[PDB]
Amino acid sequence: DPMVSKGEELFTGVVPILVELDGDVNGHKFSVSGEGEGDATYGKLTLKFICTTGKLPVPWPTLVTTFLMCFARYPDHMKQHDFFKSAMPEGYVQERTIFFKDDGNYKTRAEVKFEGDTLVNRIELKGIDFKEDGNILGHKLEYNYNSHNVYIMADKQKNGIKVNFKIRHNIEDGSVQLADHYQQNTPIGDGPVLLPDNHYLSYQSALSKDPNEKRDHMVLLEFVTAAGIT
Numbered sequence: 001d002p003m004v005s006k007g008e009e010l011f012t013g014v015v016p017i018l019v020e021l022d023g024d025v026n027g028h029k030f031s032v033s034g035e036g037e038g039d040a041t042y043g044k045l046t047l048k049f050i051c052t053t054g055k056l057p058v059p060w061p062t063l064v065t066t067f068l069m070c071f072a073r074y075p076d077h078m079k080q081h082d083f084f085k086s087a088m089p090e091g092y093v094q095e096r097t098i099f100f101k102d103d104g105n106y107k108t109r110a111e112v113k114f115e116g117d118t119l120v121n122r123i124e125l126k127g128i129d130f131k132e133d134g135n136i137l138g139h140k141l142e143y144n145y146n147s148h149n150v151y152i153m154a155d156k157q158k159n160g161i162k163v164n165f166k167i168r169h170n171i172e173d174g175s176v177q178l179a180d181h182y183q184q185n186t187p188i189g190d191g192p193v194l195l196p197d198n199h200y201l202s203y204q205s206a207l208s209k210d211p212n213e214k215r216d217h218m219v220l221l222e223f224v225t226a227a228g229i230t
Contacts, residue, residue: 003192007085011040011070016118017047019067025127026104026137028057034067038119040085043073043224051216058127059141060218061169064205065181066096066108068121069150072201072224081196081229083152083161083185089114090189092160101178104130113188135169135177142170145205149228154195160186161196199228 019034036047045068049060056063070084084092091113098106110123130137146168155162163183168176187193201224208219 001079003086003194004079007082007088008079010088010114011038011085013041014039015071017045017068017121018115018118019047019049019121019123021063021067021123021125023058023125023127025058025106025125026130029053030057032056032063032067034121038068038071040071040073043071045071045220045222045224047220047222048210048213049218049220050213054216056216058136059139059143059169061141061143061145061207062098062100062106062136062179063125063218064145064207064220065098065167065179066106066110066123066125067220068112068119068222069094069185069201069224070112070119072226074226078199078226078229080194081152081199081226083154083194083196084112086192086194087187087189088119090187090191092185092187094183094185096181096183099180099182100130100134100136101180102131103134103136103177104128111188135171140171141177142172143207144170145207146170147202147204150201150203151198151228152196152200153198155184155186156195158184158186159193159195160184197229199226201226 021032030053034049167179
């Protein structure tokens, strides 16, 4: 299937990734750059993010979902449901509002597309209404991350997909900070894309530090696999 080979032909091997975020939370401005690589054959991402403005004013875990669904591994029987790769190389827009339970919200807009051989994720983030002593600006969240399934549905009228899901961020008294995500993705080019049947992506994420790195940073290892269609 030359659509599977093509959009899929761009992710059959290791792909370099670049991530660039500009953020403003309750007026605190910050920027983050990231570099790494993705191996969609194995559903694998490995990335290192650096805050280039000094100290990150929010917890690094709260940015994990914002900082690449095109690197999911779709099983051969599910390849007709891979919207993310079908939009490449011209790419897609990924937008979210993330509602932090009892606290503020992030609104994000990203464009994910190829620049030459490098897959780029360029993001703008605005957060509003955070509590000075809540879990986000309080830096109350553990530096860790739970596995989550993400439910993908078509948004036919928008020629894209919508995605809903809840992240639970653990806190060091046993409670969690819920972050309710509402997502929409839409193609940047005008060409054909795959609008899937409902399915999910299974995510596992591990966060770590580069022991040699003095800048504020996060190392993120993610494995993502599609399922939910027998």
